[PDB]
Amino acid sequence: ENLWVTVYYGVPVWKDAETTLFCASDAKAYETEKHNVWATHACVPTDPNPQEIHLENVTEEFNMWKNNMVEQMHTDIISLWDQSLKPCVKLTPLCVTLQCTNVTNNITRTELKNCSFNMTTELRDKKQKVYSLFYRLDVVQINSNKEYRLINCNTSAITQACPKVSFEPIPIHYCAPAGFAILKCKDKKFNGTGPCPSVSTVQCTHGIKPVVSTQLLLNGSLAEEEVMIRSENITNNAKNILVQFNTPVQINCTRPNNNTRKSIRIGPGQAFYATGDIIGDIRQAHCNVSKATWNETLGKVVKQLRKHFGNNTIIRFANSSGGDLEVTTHSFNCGGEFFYCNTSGLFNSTWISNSNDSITLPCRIKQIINMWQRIGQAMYAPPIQGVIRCVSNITGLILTRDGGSTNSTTETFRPGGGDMRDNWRSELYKYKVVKIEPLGVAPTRCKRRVVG
Amino acid sequence: ITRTELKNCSFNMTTELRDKKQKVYSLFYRLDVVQINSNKE
Amino acid sequence: LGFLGAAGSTMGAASMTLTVQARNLLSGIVQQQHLLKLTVWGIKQLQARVLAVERYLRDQQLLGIWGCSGKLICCTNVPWNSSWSNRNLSEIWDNMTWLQWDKEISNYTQIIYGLLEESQNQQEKNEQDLLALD
Numbered sequence: 001e002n003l004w005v006t007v008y009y010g011v012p013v014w015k016d017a018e019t020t021l022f023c024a025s026d027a028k029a030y031e032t033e034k035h036n037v038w039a040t041h042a043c044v045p046t047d048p049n050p051q052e053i054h055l056e057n058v059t060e061e062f063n064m065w066k067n068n069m070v071e072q073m074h075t076d077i078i079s080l081w082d083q084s085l086k087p088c089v090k091l092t093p094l095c096v097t098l099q100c101t102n103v104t105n106n107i108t109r110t111e112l113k114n115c116s117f118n119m120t121t122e123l124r125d126k127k128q129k130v131y132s133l134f135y136r137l138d139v140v141q142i143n144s145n146k147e148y149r150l151i152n153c154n155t156s157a158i159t160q161a162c163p164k165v166s167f168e169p170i171p172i173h174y175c176a177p178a179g180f181a182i183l184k185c186k187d188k189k190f191n192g193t194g195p196c197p198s199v200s201t202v203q204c205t206h207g208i209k210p211v212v213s214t215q216l217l218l219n220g221s222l223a224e225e226e227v228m229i230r231s232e233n234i235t236n237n238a239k240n241i242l243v244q245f246n247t248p249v250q251i252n253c254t255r256p257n258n259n260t261r262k263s264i265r266i267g268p269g270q271a272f273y274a275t276g277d278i279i280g281d282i283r284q285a286h287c288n289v290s291k292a293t294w295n296e297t298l299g300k301v302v303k304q305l306r307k308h309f310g311n312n313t314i315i316r317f318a319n320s321s322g323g324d325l326e327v328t329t330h331s332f333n334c335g336g337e338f339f340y341c342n343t344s345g346l347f348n349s350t351w352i353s354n355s356n357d358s359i360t361l362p363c364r365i366k367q368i369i370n371m372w373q374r375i376g377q378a379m380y381a382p383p384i385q386g387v388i389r390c391v392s393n394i395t396g397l398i399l400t401r402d403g404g405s406t407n408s409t410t411e412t413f414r415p416g417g418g419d420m421r422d423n424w425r426s427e428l429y430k431y432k433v434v435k436i437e438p439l440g441v442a443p444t445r446c447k448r449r450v451v452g
Numbered sequence: 453i454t455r456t457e458l459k460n461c462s463f464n465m466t467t468e469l470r471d472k473k474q475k476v477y478s479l480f481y482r483l484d485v486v487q488i489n490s491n492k493e
Numbered sequence: 494l495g496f497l498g499a500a501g502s503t504m505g506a507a508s509m510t511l512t513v514q515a516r517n518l519l520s521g522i523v524q525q526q527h528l529l530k531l532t533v534w535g536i537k538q539l540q541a542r543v544l545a546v547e548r549y550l551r552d553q554q555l556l557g558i559w560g561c562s563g564k565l566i567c568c569t570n571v572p573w574n575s576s577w578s579n580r581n582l583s584e585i586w587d588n589m590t591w592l593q594w595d596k597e598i599s600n601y602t603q604i605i606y607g608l609l610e611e612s613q614n615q616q617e618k619n620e621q622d623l624l625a626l627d
């Protein structure tokens with residue numbers, strides 16, 4: 001006996017918890033381009049020196065499908081999207097009886113309409129007719145001379161996005177507040193979520209960019225080894241599966257249409273930017289994929305799924321069965337306009353048990369959108385005048401169920417990205433924040449002065 | 453054909469298209485409405 | 494050892510450099526750094542800076558009523574109760590991380606705090622009644 005208790009301020013202990021974070025991005029575009037939708041007009045700049053410390057002898061258990069960093073990311077981008085659209089031109093007097101006719105094809109695919117209507121002019125007393133153009137599926141028939149209707153006027157409002165807003169995703173660091181720390185896993189093969197042995201305590205995450213993609217993730221991060229397979233629950237086929245590419249496949253998307261900005265003043269100052277007549281031929285949008293480079297990626301995936309999924313059953317790769325055309329096609333915002341390249345061409349290959357040609361995909365463009373199934377308010381995308389090219393790295397895949405097969409064999413995973421939060425999980429699978437507790441009591445024979 | 457307190461009223465409003473208008477008959481309560489100046493308007 | 498360097502090391506080695514851990518936490522995060530400033534990031538910055546000081550000051554208020562206003566390590570005149578842990582002198586300090594110890598007293602950690610205020614300060618600062626001037 002005769003042991004006393006002693007206090008220690010500065011002890012390294014923590015408990016699993018989550019709180020608010022903040023943005024961090026250095027000097028990116030500022031003057032040459034500004035008014036970004038993600039970095040806002042000003043965010044807390046990150047320091048070039050990276051805050052990193054390697055932790056030894058520690059094996060903290062992470063979690064990815066129960067991590068709340070993706071939850072705050074999901075909800076931050078949503079409130080950020082609306083904050084950058086509230087001060088922009090509303091498009092309410094654009095819901096008037098549209099009388100359209102098919103475009104000039106030498107009296108003979110269609111996909112677009114040379115439509116018109118009459119709107120408000122600078123004077124509310126006077127009205128003005130202007131002929132613009134619209135895309136298919138942005139409009140659906142009402143009930144000779146075709147008379148059409150904006151599809152959104154049936155369900156929700158509409159507000160045009162601002163023309164000087166940059167929709168390019170830039171790296172947005174999520175750094176921890178004071179008294180907290182973001183633990184990153186350094187173990188390469190982090191199957192599922194368990195006890196990651198190689199941990200690093202970093203203050204600022206890496207360059208995370210908010211790629212708004214569907215079925216196929218682009219510009220993601222990865223750190224070697226077999227193409228990693230992550231699933232909240234491997235036995236349940238109903239759950240979604242995130243897949244990471246040991247090497248990215250360089251893809252290029254573009255639209256050949258040469259459009260023109262037609263500004264028409266609605267009301268006092270606001271102007272509605274629509275499509276004029278398309279100059280220099282009309283062509284369909286497409287995304288190329290390296291055919292030889294894709295056959296190796298589908299082979300590496302099926303190899304590591306094999307020891308994961310019995311390694312005895314048959315591979316059945318099909319198009320995204322069911323769903324909606326925006327949730328089953330590779331939907332993504334690129335170059336201002338919103339592409340929806342046809343996925344069904346990639347997963348036609350089936351491989352089981354033991355200058356150069358490139359596969360391409362037909363794509364269409366949509367101007368009316370309200371992503372992540374937000375039915376509150378929709379937005380019109382002004383057609384970007386001139387040329388468009390995307391040319392991004394693809395690094396991830398989103399695959400979903402394969403029916404309720406009762407035992408037997410034969411199954412895979414067809415593409416579905418029904419949830420937008422999973423897209424951010426491909427970057428935050430290794431991060432978890434903890435509540436640092438600097439207080440720690442321990443006994444030791446040790447006492448201060450007797451009387452004082 | 454014979455207390456009253458309520459009115460089977462109508463009007464025409466805006467529809468989904470600002471070009472078109474639509475008439476709908478609704479109801480209202482007394483004191484929520486007071487006369488303007490046959491057929492009551 | 495730049496920060497949490499001894500998170501996995503022994504409680505003794507972690508006790509050799511616990512200054513570092515204390516320095517970075519209050520200061521850390523580089524908080525210091527269209528015309529509006531009402532954005533979603535600024536409001537997440539301000540409240541993240543409020544708990545920064547309100548979790549620091551939540552802890553610094555405890556050391557002040559323990560005689561440890563400006564000391565990282567006080568030896569306190571409170572006797573250790575055997576029920577809290579049965580392990581000997583070199584049994585815990587040469588074997589457990591601070592992580593393991595935090596869960597081993599987390600049950601009766603509040604019982605310690607209440608007793609620390611009584612003997613080290615509630616009685617000690619009173620014991621000078623007969624000794625201050627006499």
Ligand SMILES: *[C@@H]1O[C@H](CO[C@@H]2O[C@@H](C)[C@@H](O)[C@@H](O)[C@@H]2O)[C@@H](O[C@@H]2O[C@H](CO)[C@@H](O[C@@H]3O[C@H](CO[C@H]4O[C@H](CO[C@H]5O[C@H](CO)[C@@H](O)[C@H](O)[C@@H]5O)[C@@H](O)[C@H](O)[C@@H]4O)[C@@H](O)[C@H](O[C@H]4O[C@H](CO)[C@@H](O)[C@H](O)[C@@H]4O[C@@H]4O[C@H](CO)[C@@H](O)[C@H](O)[C@H]4NC(C)=O)[C@@H]3O)[C@H](O)[C@H]2NC(C)=O)[C@H](O)[C@H]1NC(C)=O
Pocket residue numbers: 104114130131277278
């Ligand atoms: C997508 O849709 C848009 C919208 O088109 C819409 O429907 C058409 C029918 C038209 O009414 C549009 O106003 C409307 O918004 C398309 O954009 C339009 O495409 C049409 C295609 O025909 C273009 O029409 C031609 O316009 C020529 C010039 O007229 C302009 O100026 C007029 C007033 O100017 C006067 O003085 C100038 C000289 O300073 C004269 O050149 C002009 O004729 C007038 O005397 C104005 O009223 C017009 O709206 C327009 O702004 C016009 O010369 C053409 O008409 C000729 O030739 C045609 C073949 O090229 C032929 O088919 C016509 O029948 C016509 O022949 C006769 O010409 C006489 C000349 O005096 C005339 O008096 C006769 O009446 C006429 N015969 C009869 C009867 O018809 C065309 O009318 C139009 O300019 C485009 N928009 C504009 C700028 O207004 C767009 O092309 C579509 N997509 C694509 C890519 O196809």
Ligand SMILES: *[C@@H]1O[C@H](CO)[C@@H](O[C@@H]2O[C@H](CO)[C@@H](O[C@@H]3O[C@H](CO[C@H]4O[C@H](CO[C@H]5O[C@H](CO)[C@@H](O)[C@H](O)[C@@H]5O)[C@@H](O)[C@H](O)[C@@H]4O)[C@@H](O)[C@H](O[C@H]4O[C@H](CO)[C@@H](O)[C@H](O[C@H]5O[C@H](CO)[C@@H](O)[C@H](O)[C@@H]5O)[C@@H]4O)[C@@H]3O)[C@H](O)[C@H]2NC(C)=O)[C@H](O)[C@H]1NC(C)=O
Pocket residue numbers: 032033168169211212218219332333334335336385386389390391392393
């Ligand atoms: C995943 O990652 C990938 C990474 O590749 C992302 O993909 C793309 O990555 C590209 C990397 O280069 C990005 O390319 C940039 O494109 C912009 C386009 O801006 C043009 O148009 C703006 C507005 O239009 C005005 O001007 C045009 C004429 O161009 C006119 O027709 C219109 O009417 C209107 O007036 C202009 O403000 C802008 O200036 C430009 O014209 C481009 O600005 C970037 O510029 C760099 O590269 C170009 C071409 O080599 C070069 O000329 C630039 O040089 C300097 O001078 C120019 C001219 O004064 C000046 O604008 C620059 O600021 C420079 O000072 C500069 O080096 C660049 O080409 C692309 O945006 C990005 N996104 C797309 C579309 O995919 C991908 O996005 C990521 N993930 C996904 C899918 O989102």
Ligand SMILES: *[C@@H]1O[C@H](CO)[C@@H](O[C@@H]2O[C@H](CO)[C@@H](O[C@@H]3O[C@H](CO[C@H]4O[C@H](CO[C@H]5O[C@H](CO)[C@@H](O)[C@H](O)[C@@H]5O)[C@@H](O)[C@H](O[C@H]5O[C@H](CO)[C@@H](O)[C@H](O)[C@@H]5O)[C@@H]4O)[C@@H](O)[C@H](O[C@H]4O[C@H](CO)[C@@H](O)[C@H](O)[C@@H]4O)[C@@H]3O)[C@H](O)[C@H]2NC(C)=O)[C@H](O)[C@H]1NC(C)=O
Pocket residue numbers: 325329342343344345
């Ligand atoms: C994204 O892009 C993908 C691209 O695939 C697209 O998928 C399309 O989905 C639609 C609807 O689900 C398909 O639509 C129809 O398919 C019909 C099926 O073929 C019948 O007729 C056959 C003769 O067709 C020849 O070509 C087919 C390929 O389509 C080929 O298999 C045949 O061998 C043959 O060469 C007939 O053979 C076939 O069934 C017999 O043969 C098969 C194969 O040997 C055998 O297994 C069976 O047992 C049976 O013996 C079947 O009866 C097709 O007929 C139809 O229209 C065709 O003719 C019209 C008129 O000329 C053409 O205009 C049209 O181009 C077709 O040639 C129509 O195509 C479609 O096939 C899928 N793919 C495409 C585009 O071909 C997705 O929907 C896209 N996503 C979005 C967002 O839309």
Ligand SMILES: *[C@@H]1O[C@H](CO)[C@@H](O[C@@H]2O[C@H](CO)[C@@H](O[C@@H]3O[C@H](CO[C@H]4O[C@H](CO[C@H]5O[C@H](CO)[C@@H](O)[C@H](O)[C@@H]5O)[C@@H](O)[C@H](O)[C@@H]4O)[C@@H](O)[C@H](O[C@H]4O[C@H](CO)[C@@H](O)[C@H](O)[C@@H]4O)[C@@H]3O)[C@H](O)[C@H]2NC(C)=O)[C@H](O)[C@H]1NC(C)=O
Pocket residue numbers: 233234235236
């Ligand atoms: C990822 O998540 C999935 C979620 O599904 C986890 O998947 C587990 O899969 C196994 C596959 O066998 C399931 O096993 C069975 O689930 C049954 C579901 O119960 C349903 O029916 C109940 C009763 O309804 C009527 O039909 C049943 C049919 O058996 C009759 O027995 C009964 O008399 C009725 O006529 C409903 O009450 C219930 O709501 C469902 O609709 C279970 O019923 C079944 O129980 C058997 O086995 C039990 C455990 O040994 C045993 O105690 C029972 O007596 C009985 O023998 C059995 O559990 C899992 O249920 C399923 N999990 C969940 C959450 O349901 C998957 O494990 C996870 N990831 C992992 C770890 O891989």
Ligand SMILES: *[C@@H]1O[C@H](CO[C@@H]2O[C@@H](C)[C@@H](O)[C@@H](O)[C@@H]2O)[C@@H](O[C@@H]2O[C@H](CO)[C@@H](O[C@@H]3O[C@H](CO[C@H]4O[C@H](CO)[C@@H](O)[C@H](O)[C@@H]4O)[C@@H](O)[C@H](O)[C@@H]3O)[C@H](O)[C@H]2NC(C)=O)[C@H](O)[C@H]1NC(C)=O
Pocket residue numbers: 596597600601
């Ligand atoms: C820290 O303390 C907690 C809770 O203890 C409370 O707090 C402390 C400060 C004291 O004030 C205690 O008096 C308080 O009660 C401990 O939590 C225990 O966790 C375990 C595991 O989860 C609990 O075990 C349960 O066992 C149930 C089955 O009971 C079986 O045995 C009974 C008795 O014979 C029998 O009747 C029954 O039929 C079963 O055979 C089981 O159903 C349940 O799921 C659970 O496993 C235990 O009950 C908790 N404590 C108490 C006493 O409630 C921590 O373990 C402790 N940690 C440390 C490090 O000390």
Ligand SMILES: *[C@@H]1O[C@H](CO)[C@@H](O[C@@H]2O[C@H](CO)[C@@H](O[C@@H]3O[C@H](CO)[C@@H](O)[C@H](O)[C@@H]3O)[C@H](O)[C@H]2NC(C)=O)[C@H](O)[C@H]1NC(C)=O
Pocket residue numbers: 097098099117118127129
């Ligand atoms: C806004 O555009 C609409 C059409 O979407 C205008 O409504 C009427 O549209 C018809 C379409 O043919 C116009 O045609 C004209 O019809 C008359 C009589 O049948 C005919 O003599 C003319 O030669 C021509 O074919 C018509 O002008 C137009 N208005 C009327 C009175 O019917 C609408 O007028 C436009 N602007 C608004 C809202 O006032």
Ligand SMILES: *[C@@H]1O[C@H](CO)[C@@H](O[C@@H]2O[C@H](CO)[C@@H](O[C@@H]3O[C@H](CO)[C@@H](O)[C@H](O)[C@@H]3O)[C@H](O)[C@H]2NC(C)=O)[C@H](O)[C@H]1NC(C)=O
Pocket residue numbers: 190191192193194231234
């Ligand atoms: C990552 O790999 C680890 C193994 O290193 C997996 O842990 C083990 O996973 C299997 C299958 O999921 C578990 O077996 C099953 O457990 C469930 C209950 O969760 C039970 O219902 C089944 O009958 C079966 O027993 C196993 O218990 C689990 N743990 C251990 C210690 O083996 C892990 O699932 C993989 N996935 C991750 C976390 O990414």
Ligand SMILES: *[C@@H]1O[C@H](CO)[C@@H](O[C@@H]2O[C@H](CO)[C@@H](O[C@@H]3O[C@H](CO)[C@@H](O)[C@H](O)[C@@H]3O)[C@H](O)[C@H]2NC(C)=O)[C@H](O)[C@H]1NC(C)=O
Pocket residue numbers: 258279280386387
């Ligand atoms: C997309 O469409 C625009 C507009 O048509 C194209 O811009 C045009 O490019 C040509 C290339 O030679 C320019 O050169 C010449 O202009 C003279 C005078 O106007 C004209 O007589 C010649 O026939 C020739 O067009 C032209 O000035 C320029 N702009 C216009 C007003 O047509 C553009 O080239 C197309 N796509 C791209 C980006 O290449």
Ligand SMILES: *[C@@H]1O[C@H](CO)[C@@H](O[C@@H]2O[C@H](CO)[C@@H](O[C@@H]3O[C@H](CO)[C@@H](O)[C@H](O)[C@@H]3O)[C@H](O)[C@H]2NC(C)=O)[C@H](O)[C@H]1NC(C)=O
Pocket residue numbers: 463464473475
């Ligand atoms: C919205 O409702 C108003 C009424 O509050 C419409 O104004 C006119 O209301 C009268 C009420 O009797 C309608 O009666 C019609 O009168 C004509 C001619 O006197 C008669 O031949 C018919 O048998 C019938 O009794 C009339 O249709 C209606 N419009 C006109 C042109 O007078 C108003 O038209 C409605 N919608 C709007 C704002 O356009």
Ligand SMILES: *[C@@H]1O[C@H](CO)[C@@H](O[C@@H]2O[C@H](CO)[C@@H](O)[C@H](O)[C@H]2NC(C)=O)[C@H](O)[C@H]1NC(C)=O
Pocket residue numbers: 306307311
């Ligand atoms: C697919 O399965 C075969 C056999 O079912 C694997 O070959 C090895 O088989 C033995 C005995 O069944 C196992 O103990 C080994 O673990 C198997 N190899 C490994 C490394 O898993 C074959 O390897 C499996 N597919 C692949 C290519 O991994």
Ligand SMILES: *[C@@H]1O[C@H](CO)[C@@H](O)[C@H](O)[C@H]1NC(C)=O
Pocket residue numbers: 102110
């Ligand atoms: C225009 O395209 C629509 C698409 O449904 C079609 O119904 C209509 O018949 C076409 N009209 C002409 C004449 O091409």
Ligand SMILES: *[C@@H]1O[C@H](CO)[C@@H](O)[C@H](O)[C@H]1NC(C)=O
Pocket residue numbers: 250251252288289290291358391
């Ligand atoms: C994309 O464009 C680049 C331009 O050099 C080209 O080298 C590459 O092969 C293209 N990839 C595909 C398949 O689209």
Ligand SMILES: *[C@@H]1O[C@H](CO)[C@@H](O)[C@H](O)[C@H]1NC(C)=O
Pocket residue numbers: 001579580581582
């Ligand atoms: C070691 O622990 C026992 C109780 O298990 C205790 O009686 C003994 O006093 C401790 N050793 C020392 C150094 O006092």
